[PDB]
C-alpha cells in the first residue's frame, strides 16, 4: 500500500504536521484555520489520510463534503493546499513517483472540499 510505501503510520503523521504548518505560513490559505485546533487537525487528517493510502484503520470521522460546507475554497486554494502537501513530501525524503501517487490520492477530495 502507499501507506506502507511511505513509511508507515508515524510517516504520515509527520507530513501532515508538515502540510498544515505550510499551509498556516501561507497567507492565501492560512485565514481559513483562524481559531482551529491545529492538533486535532493534524490528527485527524492523518487518520483520513492513513485509510485513503491503503492503511489497516477504515476513517470513522466526518463526512468531508459537509465538513468544507460554506467555507468558501476556491479550485486554486485547493490547488495550494495541494502544494503544501508535495512539499511537505518531498521535504521528508519522499520519493518522488511516491510523492504524486500520495498527491493523486489526495485530489480525489476535490469535489467534497471545494465549493466555489
Ligand atoms: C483549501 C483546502 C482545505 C481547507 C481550507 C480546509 C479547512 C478545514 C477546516 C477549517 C476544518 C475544521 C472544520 C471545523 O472546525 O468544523 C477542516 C476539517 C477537516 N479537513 Fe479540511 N481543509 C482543506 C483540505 C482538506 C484536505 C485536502 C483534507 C484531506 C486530505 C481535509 C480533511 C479534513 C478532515 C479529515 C477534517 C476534520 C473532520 C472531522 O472533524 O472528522 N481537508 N478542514
Known amino acids: 500500500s502507499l501507506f506502507e510505501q511511505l513509511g508507515g503510520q508515524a510517516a504520515v503523521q509527520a507530513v501532515t504536521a ?6 498556516q505560513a501561507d497567507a492565501t490559505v492560512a485565514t481559513f484555520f483562524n481559531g482551529i485546533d491545529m492538533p486535532n ?3 485527524k487528517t492523518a487518520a483520513f489520510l492513513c485509510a ?3 492503511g489497516p484503520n477504515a476513517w470513522t470521522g466526518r463526512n468531508l463534503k459537509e465538513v468544507h460546507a460554506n467555507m ?3 479550485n486554486a486554494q485547493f490547488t495550494t493546499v495541494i502544494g503544501h502537501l508535495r512539499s511537505a513530501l518531498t521535504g521528508a525524503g519522499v520519493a518522488a513517483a511516491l510523492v504524486e501517487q500520495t498527491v493523486a490520492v489526495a485530489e480525489t477530495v476535490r469535489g467534497d472540499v471545494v465549493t466555489v
Open 18 to 23: 508538515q502540510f498544515y504548518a505550510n499551509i
Open 41 to 43: 487537525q493534524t490528527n
Open 52 to 54: 485513503a493510502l491503503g
Open 72 to 74: 468558501g475554497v476556491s
